[PDB]
Structure formats: structure tokens, C-alpha cells
Amino acid sequence: MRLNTLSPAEGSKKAGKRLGRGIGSGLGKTGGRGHKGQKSRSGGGVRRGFEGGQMPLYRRLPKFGFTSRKAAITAEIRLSDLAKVEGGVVDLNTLKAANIIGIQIEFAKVILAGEVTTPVTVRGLRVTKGARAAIEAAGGKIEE
Amino acid sequence: PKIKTVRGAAKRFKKTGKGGFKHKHANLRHILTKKATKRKRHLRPKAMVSKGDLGLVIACLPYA
Amino acid sequence: GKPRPYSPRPTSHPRPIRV
Amino acid sequence: ARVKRGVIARARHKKILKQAKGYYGARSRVYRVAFQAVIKAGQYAYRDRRQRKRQFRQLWIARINAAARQNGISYSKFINGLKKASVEIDRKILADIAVFDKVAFTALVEKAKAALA
Amino acid sequence: MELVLKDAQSALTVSETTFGRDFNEALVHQVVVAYAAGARQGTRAQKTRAEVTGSGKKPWRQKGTGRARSGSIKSPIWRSGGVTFAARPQDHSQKVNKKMYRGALKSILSELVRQDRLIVVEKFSVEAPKTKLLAQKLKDMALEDVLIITGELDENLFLAARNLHKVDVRDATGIDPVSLIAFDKVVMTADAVKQVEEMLA
RNA sequence: UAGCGGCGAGCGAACGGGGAGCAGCCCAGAGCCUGAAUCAGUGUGUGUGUUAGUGGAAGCGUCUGGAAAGGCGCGCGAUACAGGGUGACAGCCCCGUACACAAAAAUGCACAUGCUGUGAGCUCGAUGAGUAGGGCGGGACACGUGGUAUCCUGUCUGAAUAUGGGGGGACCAUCCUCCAAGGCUAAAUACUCCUGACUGACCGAUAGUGAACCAGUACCGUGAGGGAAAGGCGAAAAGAACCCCGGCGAGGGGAGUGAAAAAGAACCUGAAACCGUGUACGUACAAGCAGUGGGAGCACGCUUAGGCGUGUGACUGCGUACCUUUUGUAUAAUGGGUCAGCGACUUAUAUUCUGUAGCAAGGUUAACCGAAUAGGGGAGCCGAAGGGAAACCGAGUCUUAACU
Ligand SMILES: *[C@H]1O[C@H](CO)[C@H](O)[C@H](O)[C@H]1NC(C)=O
Ligand SMILES: [Mg+2]
Ligand SMILES: [Mg+2]
Ligand SMILES: [Mg+2]
Ligand SMILES: [Mg+2]
Ligand SMILES: [Mg+2]
Ligand SMILES: [Mg+2]
Ligand SMILES: [Mg+2]
Ligand SMILES: [Mg+2]
Ligand SMILES: [Mg+2]
Ligand SMILES: [Mg+2]
Ligand SMILES: [Mg+2]
Ligand SMILES: [Mg+2]
Ligand SMILES: [Mg+2]
Ligand SMILES: [Mg+2]
Ligand SMILES: [Mg+2]
Ligand SMILES: [Mg+2]
Ligand SMILES: [Mg+2]
Ligand SMILES: [Mg+2]
Ligand SMILES: [Mg+2]
Ligand SMILES: [Mg+2]
Ligand SMILES: [Mg+2]
Ligand SMILES: [Mg+2]
Ligand SMILES: [Mg+2]
Ligand SMILES: [Mg+2]
Ligand SMILES: [Mg+2]
Ligand SMILES: [Mg+2]
Ligand SMILES: [Mg+2]
Ligand SMILES: [Mg+2]
Ligand SMILES: [Mg+2]
Ligand SMILES: [Mg+2]
Ligand SMILES: [Mg+2]
Ligand SMILES: [Mg+2]
Ligand SMILES: [Mg+2]
Ligand SMILES: [Mg+2]
Ligand SMILES: [Mg+2]
Ligand SMILES: [Mg+2]
Ligand SMILES: [Mg+2]
Ligand SMILES: [Mg+2]
Ligand SMILES: [Mg+2]
Ligand SMILES: [Mg+2]
Ligand SMILES: [Mg+2]
């Protein structure tokens, strides 16, 4: 192990395409752009979604729905998270100390995802039927 | 700089679980009287972007 | 190398009009 | 990191100019003309390695046709004769014998004549 | 795992996780390269056709002259023209994951033990800030090219080493991967090995 | 992202979070006490920069060579082996460098201390009107008049004034929060005509500045304005006394200098196109991309005196350049007089996929701090759950009164 005996792993350093450097290389002359038309030109190419003038897919389909401001401040908590909090009292603000939900979240919900294996006390969260079973099954106590 | 979303596409397509996109059917906005109830009923539910169109949609929605 | 070209100078004959 | 092309370009051009020695005029002096000429020499060389085999067989056959007709038989009969008599000496050797050992060639023509008899 | 001290003639226990693991050449390479790239200043520029000094006057009319059409005297095709893709100052620094950096240190130290290059002592200092003293100490300890990692950097040993080009003297906080590989032998003080252990975990 | 948007192309926040920095005050006024805080200006000492500088270690012999710093040998200094120079490559020959010192004079900065103005503190007040708001027209807000809050105002108007007023995105009620129509305010921030020092996986004379050179010059233009080319003798000029041909020339030959003059100033190296002298072979009855395959003869050099190598190439088979563009080009389609140098897929940031590496239900930090390529910093971001327009539900969910 000297500075002139370190090699990279095989396949870690693929050499970049160099266009317009002769016949041998297989990217000489046109450099893979083919012959003429818009796509062969410096700065050439049509914009994203462009279909040649046909009404593009993202404009012949109707807009639908609206964005909820409520959804943005609503988080989901996995059973695997309940353990990661300090105190065994899964409040809204103990989840925030734990870095489990964001600082702006106002409404959390515990769902049947992962296995809770400790007595945990869920206070002031919504909890799924599946989750309620699993927390109660480990001695946990869900209160409003 | 960040790629910019094609905002019109973001209003037409939602990303689903396996990574496809759902979208609303065309032809259910107006001129409804002359259309068969059967036709209209089959246009109500959302639909999945076809294989052909995915490339275009993906380009438009880099942050989907 | 090449010298800078001259501005238009007088022409001895008109270009033939194919039209 | 700027790379001057001088030394490498010099060597590429010399490589080509050296292969163009003996060519007429610009063809041995002028890179642009020497290059075209060295390529075309290459193309002819490839083509002619094949043609050389065609030209030599054609020569050999002509000489065997002479030597055989001297011995009172055509090339076509003689070669047919040599196959019926199961002789496998190839045209390069027949031709070489036809020039250098005319006794031996007569022997071969007799063996041919026998097979057809 | 036990590192024997050559000065006092004893042993010193160290983590197998820091001095025992196999040599991940690929990972060390990525980190050595990233270190070299982090040393680059990246200070240069050429002039584009935009930046070269001259007017935007079309040198001659588009048609009729019998010459190649021209638009700017700054065209990169022209002598004295812009550089087609003129360099700007670049940041060549790479991100190295904390864990990949620490990984590479562990791989290098583990190799410095296997090739008998990590010479661990208990106490390494000199009396006065004199280069003659350290040169004498190094010929006795029988090494020329060496990296000396001490606990707290002694002003005297710092000054003594300063004018010996083969010799470098650092505190444990100051071990870089390139220096650990670059030097023939690495002399770590027992105190330093404790810090390098604590530092890498 | 939310939004805005011929809902096109595009435009694009805020709240909130992490950091750098952090500083508060005054007038709209009268009395009391006083002139006491704090800012400046002004001298006077004090340190400490700046504007000249001082000292600053240690090498000899021999070999090659024109010359030694190079080879070999044996020494010595190093808080100095940064860098530069010196007849080739010098830690010890020189200038420096580390380090330690220095200011009559002027001046920046900091405190300290007189002097001049400056006016603190407490009490009782007061609390910015053609203004807020409105109508009409514009503009600014990410926000294009939109359901459009907010800001600004050209035009026309016009309150309340703390029991009051502004805002919380049409609007109303409630609640919350702030107090416009007077003003000042350091730091974190932006920039470099310019000074010093230092650095470069920046250039090295068609590059790098237009400009390495007496260049914004010569030159061009009425003028604004445009705008070149052009670097290198040698270590040292020792830059060639003298002689000779020549027009008391140019140019040259000797001589001499020098390591070298085929380093002689038109000067390092000295390529190619291009132009000659000489030698070998071929060539004046022979038709075309000029080669190629065959091949005699001649000349030359070798190691069997012999083949082999080299040059030439009579004669003979085959054979219509290259590039581009095209269905297709010997094409009488395009482009190139030739050479030399330069001349075209980059860079930045996003995003996706592949390979590779680390770690793995986790992974990873950004700014920033830190002398730190370390270490800190987890603010965030991506992932581990989806369905639904949404509320919401959740390994399900949506659809539907309900699903086989
Ligand atoms: C020369 O040609 C020019 C065009 O280029 C004018 O037509 C001009 O009049 C011509 N003059 C003659 C003499 O024909
Ligand atoms: Mg190809
Ligand atoms: Mg083309
Ligand atoms: Mg085409
Ligand atoms: Mg194409
Ligand atoms: Mg362009
Ligand atoms: Mg149309
Ligand atoms: Mg967080
Ligand atoms: Mg409808
Ligand atoms: Mg030219
Ligand atoms: Mg270079
Ligand atoms: Mg030649
Ligand atoms: Mg330039
Ligand atoms: Mg870090
Ligand atoms: Mg000295
Ligand atoms: Mg010597
Ligand atoms: Mg020399
Ligand atoms: Mg007020
Ligand atoms: Mg208002
Ligand atoms: Mg108003
Ligand atoms: Mg209004
Ligand atoms: Mg309001
Ligand atoms: Mg409150
Ligand atoms: Mg220049
Ligand atoms: Mg040069
Ligand atoms: Mg003039
Ligand atoms: Mg003379
Ligand atoms: Mg020289
Ligand atoms: Mg010369
Ligand atoms: Mg020449
Ligand atoms: Mg004739
Ligand atoms: Mg003849
Ligand atoms: Mg002819
Ligand atoms: Mg022919
Ligand atoms: Mg055609
Ligand atoms: Mg043809
Ligand atoms: Mg034709
Ligand atoms: Mg042609
Ligand atoms: Mg022709
Ligand atoms: Mg054309
Ligand atoms: Mg032409
Ligand atoms: Mg979800």
C-alpha cells in the first residue's frame, strides 16, 4: 500500500464518450446525432411534452382534484417509531423531539406498520384498528 | 438549477404506488346529453397512463 | 492567411438574367 | 492543462509520408495527397493478394496447356487423364515440371493418356 | 489485539475493529483520490468569444466577397479568438461519506500494522528545539522517512522536525489518509493510539 | 412545494426551521433637579501597527567537463532544505530564508487623561390629517382582476383620533395581535480602479491581456470608433585586430575569439510545404486516379562468392482521387493550391438509469462552527404504506345504498 499501488474497483470508472474524434471510435463525424434535422443541431431538441404539434397528453386530459392544506400538516407514525421516543408516552410533541414527524405537523396517526414490543402510552393521536390491537397486545394504553 | 415541473402536467397526473400515473378520462366535460350513460359511466373512474405515454409524463414530472 | 476582402467595386458586365 | 499537437501530428504525417516513398509528385510530398495514395495502395494490396492466386493459376494452366499440346493432348483431356489415373500433383508443380523436366512431363502425359485409353 | 512498544518493551491492547480489518483497496482509493481533489485550487479561466477584447462588427459582408462567411473577429475558429469552452474557476472537492472516510482510515491503519510500518512507542520527544537532536534520535530508532503522531503537539519536536523534509510531526486529530500511506514508517505514541482508537471507534 | 399562468411557454412564494450577526434610541414638551450619561472635535502621555532598515548558521578533496552546483569520498548547519542567482542540478559561493532586533520624522488604531461643546435621571403630559379609508386609472406584491386581501399613487374625495385605529388573503362576527400618517442607528452583506504578500493538476509567444517588445502604439477612419505584427547570440562581447576579392561597396574567404561561429548579430533548436547542386537507375513508337500484383535488366552494400539486403522499374494483369450530400456520384454535384500551427459534444446545477463503494430499515447531512480535507452541526432530504379530489380511512382503500 503506497500512493502508486492503489487501484479503483473494476467497473467503477467507465471512460466518458468523446464525440467527433475519428472513424475508429465509432462516434466520429456526426457524433451519434445522425444526419440533419432539429435533433442534430447545437441547442437543438423540442421541449418536454412536445408531440410535434398534436395537443400534448398533459393538455388533452382534464385537470382534476385540489390540494388539501390539512394533508400537509397530517403525518403517519409506524409502530416501529413508538419505541424510538423517550419516555414511553407517544404525545404529538414527544414524536417531534424524536424527529419522527415534522415541526409543523398538527395531526398524527399510528398505523399497523412494523411490530411494537414495549408498553407504550399513545396520548392525543388517532390510531388505526390494526394499530390499536397491536399496542394493546403489548400492554399499551391508548387515551384521547 | 432545479428542474422545473411542468405545472399543467402536475394538475393532470398523480403518481401511484408501483410508480405509474393515474389521470382523469377525457370526454366527460360537456356535450354530455348525446353520450350513452354506459360510455359516461366508464369515463368516470380514474385510469392509468399507457406504456407509450409514460416517457412523456415522466419528463414533465421529475419530482413526482 | 487571406487579406480582408474589398467592398464592392465596379463590374465590367451585368450578370445574365435567367428570368 | 493545454495540449500542443505539434510533436504527435508531426509523427502521424511522417508515418504516412514514409509509406508514400517512390510515389509521383504531390503523392510523396503532400500529406493530404500521400494519405489518399497510401490508403489506395492498401486497398489494391488487399485486392491483389487474392488476384495473385488467380493470375498464377492462370499462368500455370497456360504453361501446362503448351507442354501437353507438345505431347499431343489438350490441357482439358490431360487434367481429366491425371484424375482418372489418380495423380494429385497440383498445377504449380506440373507447370514447374513442364519447364524444367520435359522427360518427367512426357511420363505424366503418358499416364494421363493411359487412363483415358 | 496487541501492539508491542519498541522503546519500553511492553504491549498495548487496541480494537480489532480499527487495527484488525482487511484492506478495502477500492474504499481507500476513493478516499485518497478525494483527498488529492480536495487539495486542488481550481483557479484559472480562459476568455470565451464574449470576453475577448474587440468589437461585435461583422468583419466583412455576408455575401459577395468570395470568403468564408464571418460574424465576429472573436470566433474561436480565428487566431486571437475566444476559447470554445473557456475554463472558469472550479471547486474540485468531492463529498466523502463520514463512514467511508473512517472506513478508509481503519483499512490503512490495519495495513500499516500488517506491513510492520506502524511503530508504536510510549514517549517520543526531544530536549531542546534542535533539528540535530531529532535527526540523531531518528538514526538511533533506525528510520529516515517517518510520520510522528503524538498526543499533544510538543512545540520543541514540531520545530526540530520542521526542517527535515522526510519527517512530519502531527497530533492524532491531524492524521490524513494520504500521509498515513505516503510515509515509509508511522511512529504513533501510545497516548495517540488511544485518541485514534477513540476517534475512529 | 403553495400558488400565478393565451392554466400555454413559463413565472414562483410564505409560514416554519437551522445558521452568520446582534443594539438600541430620539423629536412631536413643560417643570423639577441640574448640567451628572453618551457621542463627537481638540490637544497630552501610553502602548501597538505603517512609512527606511540591522544581524542572520554551516564544505572541502578528487573525477568528468569550456565551466561543477553533477559523479565518487569524507565533513558540517538546520526554529534557516521557502525562493532566487551563480559558466550544468548548491542547505553550507552569493542574495535570502528561520529567528532576533530597529525609527529623528510623519501617520493609522487602541485605551488613558485635561479642554470645548454635547446634554443624563425622575415626575406630569402629549402620541405625526388632506392622512387612513373610499371612487376612477395605472403600477408593485410569486399572485396576469381574478372571489383578490396587502402595498404605491396620477386623478376626485375623505374619517376616527386610545371609550380610538391597523392587520390576521373577498367579506361579516368573534378572538388574537400591533399602533400608520416624524426621524436616527453598528455588525453579519456587496464590490476591487488600486497596494503588499502568498498560491495554482492556469498559459508559455498563432497560448496568456489587444499589448512579454517604447501598444491602445503603427496603421485605418471626417468622427464616434477600429486596431495589429513583433520575445531567445554567448557563461562572458571575448560582437570578429589584421590580410585578401570587391565600387575606400553589398557580400564573401582566411585569421582570431569562443566549449561551439553550420552560436556572426538576417544569431538557441531549426520541422514541413517550396527551390536547387550531386550521384544511381529509368525515360524520346508511347495513351488515362499514376498505384497495385507480377517482373527482367542495371547500380550498390554485405558474412556462402554466394544468395540476401538497398535503390531503380523496361514489360505485363487489375485498377475512374478524397470529403460531403444522396435512391444513386469517376462524376461535368459540394469543398480543399500546398505546408505548418490553431480550429467543433464543454461547464454548472438539477433529475433519472447503469456500474462501483460505504452503511443498511435505515442512509445522509446543508449553511455554519472548527487553524483544521478531521471533528462538530441531522435544520432538512430520501426511504421504510397505501388508497381517495378531499375529509378521512389504513394493509388496505376508493367506487356504490351494497358489492358476488
Ligand atoms: C456590373 O454588375 C453590377 C451588379 O453586380 C451592376 O449590375 C452594374 O451595373 C454592372 N455593370 C455593367 C457594366 O454591366
Ligand atoms: Mg456507427
Ligand atoms: Mg453533414
Ligand atoms: Mg434527411
Ligand atoms: Mg435525426
Ligand atoms: Mg447557436
Ligand atoms: Mg393544429
Ligand atoms: Mg427534524
Ligand atoms: Mg363537469
Ligand atoms: Mg490557410
Ligand atoms: Mg504547457
Ligand atoms: Mg521527400
Ligand atoms: Mg487569447
Ligand atoms: Mg464534515
Ligand atoms: Mg548567511
Ligand atoms: Mg565535486
Ligand atoms: Mg549548458
Ligand atoms: Mg402614531
Ligand atoms: Mg391600509
Ligand atoms: Mg390611499
Ligand atoms: Mg380597497
Ligand atoms: Mg382586512
Ligand atoms: Mg398573547
Ligand atoms: Mg499575443
Ligand atoms: Mg517558438
Ligand atoms: Mg487621422
Ligand atoms: Mg564586410
Ligand atoms: Mg544555453
Ligand atoms: Mg538558428
Ligand atoms: Mg528543409
Ligand atoms: Mg507504332
Ligand atoms: Mg523506346
Ligand atoms: Mg499521356
Ligand atoms: Mg486498366
Ligand atoms: Mg438528386
Ligand atoms: Mg460508380
Ligand atoms: Mg455526370
Ligand atoms: Mg468534383
Ligand atoms: Mg475532370
Ligand atoms: Mg449544394
Ligand atoms: Mg474549389
Ligand atoms: Mg399516504
Q: What's the CATH code of the domain at E181?
A: 3.40.1370.10
Determine the residue type at E72.
S
Cα angle for residues D34, D38, D42 (degrees, 5° grid): 170
Let me know how long chain A is: 144
Cβ density class D32-68: b for 16+ within 10 Å, e for less: eebbebbeeeeeeeeeeeeeeeeeeeeebeebbbebb
Domain count, chain E: 1
Ligand 1 interacting residues, C-beta cut-off 6 A: C 11-14
As a whole number of angstroms, the distance between CA D18 and CA D28 comes to 8
Q: Which residue has the cell 405509474?
A: B20
Closest CB from C4, C5, C7 relative to E66: C5
First to last CA, chain A: 63
Domain count, chain D: 1
As a whole number of angstroms, the distance between CA E121 and CA D1 comes to 45
Determine the residue type at D53.
K
Listed in sequence order, the residues at least 6 apart from E45 whose beta carbon sits closer than 8 Å to its beta carbon are E86, E87, E88, E89
User: What kind and span of H or E run contains E123?
Assistant: none
As a whole number of angstroms, the distance between CA E53 and CA E80 comes to 10
Residue D13 CA to ligand 29 center (angstroms) comes to 24
Listed in sequence order, the residues at least 6 apart from E173 whose beta carbon sits closer than 8 Å to its beta carbon are E195, E199
Domain ranges, residue E146: 2-200
How far is the alpha carbon of A78 from chain B, nearest alpha carbon, in Å? 18
Closest to E155 measured CA to CA, from E129, E187, E124: E129
E65 CB contact with strand F at below 7 Å: no
Closest to A58 measured CA to CA, from E174, B5, E145, B28: B5
As a whole number of angstroms, the distance between CA D75 and CA E29 comes to 76
Domain count, chain B: 1
As a whole number of angstroms, the distance between CA E146 and CA B61 comes to 57
**Phi, psi angles (nearest 5°) of residue E77:** -70, -30
As a whole number of angstroms, the distance between CA E15 and CA E196 comes to 11
Closest to D93 measured CA to CA, from D69, D57, D117, D68: D57
CATH number of A69-142: 3.100.10.10
Half-sphere exposure of E17 (CA within 13 A, CB side): 8
How far is the alpha carbon of C6 from chain E, nearest alpha carbon, in Å? 7
Contact in structure between E175 and E159 (CB atoms under 8 Å): no
Domain ranges, residue D50: 1-117
User: What 3-state DSSP class applies to E12?
Assistant: strand
Let me know how long chain B is: 64
Closest to D116 measured CA to CA, from D80, D70, D71, D67: D80
Which residues 37-76 of chain D have a CB under 7 Å from nucleic chain F? 37, 39-41, 44-45, 47-49, 51-52, 55
- Which atom belonging to ligand 1 lies closest to the Cα atom of C12? 13
Q: Give, in Å, how far the C1' of F399 lies from the CA of E11.
A: 75
How many C-beta neighbours within 10 Å does residue A82 have? Answer: 27
B60/A58 touch (CB, cutoff 8 Å), yes or no: yes
Cα angle for residues D26, D31, D35 (degrees, 5° grid): 95
Residue B64 CA to ligand 41 center (angstroms) comes to 57
Contact in structure between B15 and A52 (CB atoms under 8 Å): no
A–B contact: 3+ Cβ pairs < 8 A: yes
Listed in sequence order, the residues at least 6 apart from D86 whose beta carbon sits closer than 8 Å to its beta carbon are none
As a whole number of angstroms, the distance between CA E161 and CA E167 comes to 6
As a whole number of angstroms, the distance between CA D110 and CA E78 comes to 82
As a whole number of angstroms, the distance between CA E124 and CA E169 comes to 11
Resolution in A: 2.3
Q: Between β-strands A121-122 and A89-90, what pairing exists: parallel, antiparallel or unpaired? A: parallel
Experimental determination technique: cryo-EM
As a whole number of angstroms, the distance between CA B64 and CA B61 comes to 5
E65/C2 touch (CB, cutoff 8 Å), yes or no: no
As a whole number of angstroms, the distance between CA E22 and CA E113 comes to 11
How many C-beta neighbours within 10 Å does residue A111 have? Answer: 15
Domain ranges, residue B25: 1-64
> From the DSSP assignment, how many helices (H) and strands (E) are in chain E?
7, 6
